[PDB]
C-alpha cells in the first residue's frame, strides 16, 4: 500500500504524480530560475557599464593632463 508518499512534504516535487501537474511544475520553477538569471546578468551588466564609463573618463582626464607635455 502506497503510504510513504504521504510522508513527503506537500510542496516537494515528488508529491506530483504524473502528467499535467508535473508539466506545470516544471514550467513555473524553470521560469523562476530563468528569471533570477536574467536579473543577475542585468545587475552585473549595469556595474560593468559603470566601470567602463568611469574608466574611459580617467583615460580622457589623463590625456588632457598629458596634453600639457
30 binds Mg ion (CB under 5 A): no
Using DSSP's 3-state secondary structure scheme, residue 19 falls into coil
- What's the chain's Rg over C-alpha atoms? 26
**Cβ pair 60, 54 in contact under 8 A:** no
When CB distances to Mg ion are compared, the closest residue is 25
Of the candidate residues 2, 34, 48, 67, the single one contacting a second copy (CB under 8 A): 48
40 binds a second copy (CB under 8 A): yes
65 binds a second copy (CB under 8 A): no
Residue with cell 524553470: 30
Residues that bind Mg ion (CB under 5 A): 25
Amino acid at each position: 500500500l502506497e503510504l510513504q508518499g504521504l510522508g513527503v512534504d506537500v510542496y516537494d516535487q515528488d508529491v506530483l504524480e504524473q502528467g499535467v501537474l508535473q508539466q506545470v511544475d516544471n514550467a513555473i520553477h524553470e521560469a523562476s530560475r530563468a528569471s533570477q538569471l536574467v536579473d543577475v546578468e542585468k545587475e552585473y551588466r549595469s556595474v560593468l557599464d559603470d566601470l567602463t564609463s568611469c574608466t574611459t573618463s580617467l583615460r580622457q582626464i589623463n590625456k588632457i593632463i598629458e596634453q600639457l607635455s
